[PDB]
A paper describes a structure:
The NspER1-L1,5 WT and mutants Q204K, Q350K, D352K, and T354K crystallized under the crystallization condition containing 10 g L−1 of purified protein and 150 g L−1 PEG 6000 in the crystallization buffer, whereby the crystal amount was highest, and the crystal size was smallest for mutant T354K, followed by Q204K and D352K. Mutants D352K and T354K crystallizing in the same space group P1211 as the wild type showed, again, an excellent agreement in crystal packing. The distance of 3.5 Å between the carboxy group of E27 and the amino group of mutant T354K indicates the formation of a salt bridge. Distances between the participating functional groups of salt bridges were defined to be ≤4 Å, which could be applied to T354K, explaining its enhanced crystallizability. The neighboring NspER1-L1,5 mutants Q350K, D352K, and T354K led to an interaction with intermolecular E25/27 and an increase in crystallizability (Section 3.2, Section 3.3 and Section 3.4), with the strongest impact for T354K. This indicates that introducing electrostatic interactions is not limited to single positions but can also be applied to suitable neighboring amino acid residues, making the approach even more applicable.
To generalize this engineering approach for crystal contacts, a non-ADH-homologous enzyme was selected to apply the established strategies to the Nostoc sp. PCC 1720 ene reductase (NostocER). This oxidoreductase from the old yellow enzyme family (OYE, EC 1.6.99.1) catalyzes the trans-hydrogenations of activated alkenes, demonstrating its industrial relevance as a biocatalyst. As OYEs are strongly dependent on cost-intensive NADPH as a cofactor, Mähler et al. engineered NADH-accepting variants (NostocER1) by exchanging NostocER loop regions at cofactor-binding sites to ER loop regions from Achromobacter sp. JA81 and Acaryochloris marina with a higher NADH affinity. For this study, the NostocER1 Loop1,5 variant (NostocER1-L1,5) was selected as an example protein for the rational introduction of Lys–Glu interactions at crystal contacts to demonstrate the impact of rational single amino acid exchanges on the crystallizability of proteins and enhance protein crystallization.
Numbering used by the authors: 15 to 370
Write the structure that this text describes.
Amino acid sequence: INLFSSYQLGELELPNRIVMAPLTRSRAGEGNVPHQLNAIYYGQRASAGLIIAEATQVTPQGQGYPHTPGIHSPEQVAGWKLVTDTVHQQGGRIFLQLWHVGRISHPDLQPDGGLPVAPSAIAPKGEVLTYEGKKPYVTPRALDTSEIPAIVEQYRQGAANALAAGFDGVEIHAANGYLIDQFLRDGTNQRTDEYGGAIENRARLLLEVTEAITSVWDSQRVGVRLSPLTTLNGCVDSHPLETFGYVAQALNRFNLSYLHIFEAIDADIRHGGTVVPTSHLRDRFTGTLIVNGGYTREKGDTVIANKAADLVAFGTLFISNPDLPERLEVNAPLNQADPKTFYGGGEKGYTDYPFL
Ligand SMILES: Cc1cc2nc3c(=O)[nH]c(=O)nc-3n(C[C@H](O)[C@H](O)[C@H](O)COP(=O)(O)O)c2cc1C
Ligand SMILES: CC(=O)C1=CC(C(C)=O)(C(C)=O)C=C[C@H]1C
Ligand SMILES: [Cl-]
Ligand code: NA
């Protein structure tokens, strides 16, 4: 087996092992609604074994950056259906990444100019982009215990909206220091209720969110993404091996589509070595594993052949190469990604990277 082998993901038949990683492109229109241009972008990439669409806020409070799309309104459902229809017409498969940014936001992006919510009242460091340029972060409000059901319900409604939008499945974003990750990691979570302290408490929001989403979706169409060794957004855990190893085992109850690991590119250089080898998680999580982070044809074939992972997601290379699968398959030159046009804007650096 290699990166071009087919794969059975529940009832979905993937033509290859190549996944398009979720990539925020900040190109939503008024009301954070997807539009035709976005449909073209994802349709261009439909040769992917599976596309995971960009992080998409499940509720207004879950937005943290200008012009990211939502999945909380009927108008957003309609705009996403343009996208899933195009991907389906092009013979592809697409899951929606369900987001809530938690503390990584600013009042200017929040309903009524209120505070971002979080497990604990810990201000991120530095500045955050608003509609009026960069502004200092404020301190988020720590959620009351009694409010956690409402967070879980916002994710359940986000998942239901994704189903109405015609996606093939959803991915729970539990990585990169956003809301669920903020609860996971003891650096961001110092709660003294059942959602803080012990690992089974820190993992509780993830597990409750997953349980609610599997009430809407068949479980084999629900994935979870973790990023055990990122330090993005000021979110770190003091015992990542035990924390993430626990989560990989706890998720098995749900019979999920997959577990997706973003392997931080800078982890070894920082952490002075390999704190959480992905093999540790591979051995604990009994389902499909997607791995991600600086993969190539050569690196992806190896992890598949070695049984270290089942699926390989590419982020950066999918920005710049719409036909990435084909290019990898024939060892074609790859287009170089232009960082200047990753976030915001229009067609330039989005739909105008050429096919082979
Ligand atoms: C422009 C850009 C936007 C990203 N947006 C997301 C996101 O929406 N959700 C997410 O989980 N990761 C996101 N990431 C992380 C990527 O999915 C991916 O894990 C990372 O870029 C490493 O993979 P790569 O080396 O193949 O690019 C983003 C990365 C980039 C470069
Ligand atoms: C939503 C998301 O995960 C994003 C990832 C990053 C990244 C990998 O560096 C980040 C956490 O800042 C880039 C863009 C966003 C939104
Ligand atoms: Cl196509
Ligand atoms: Na199914």
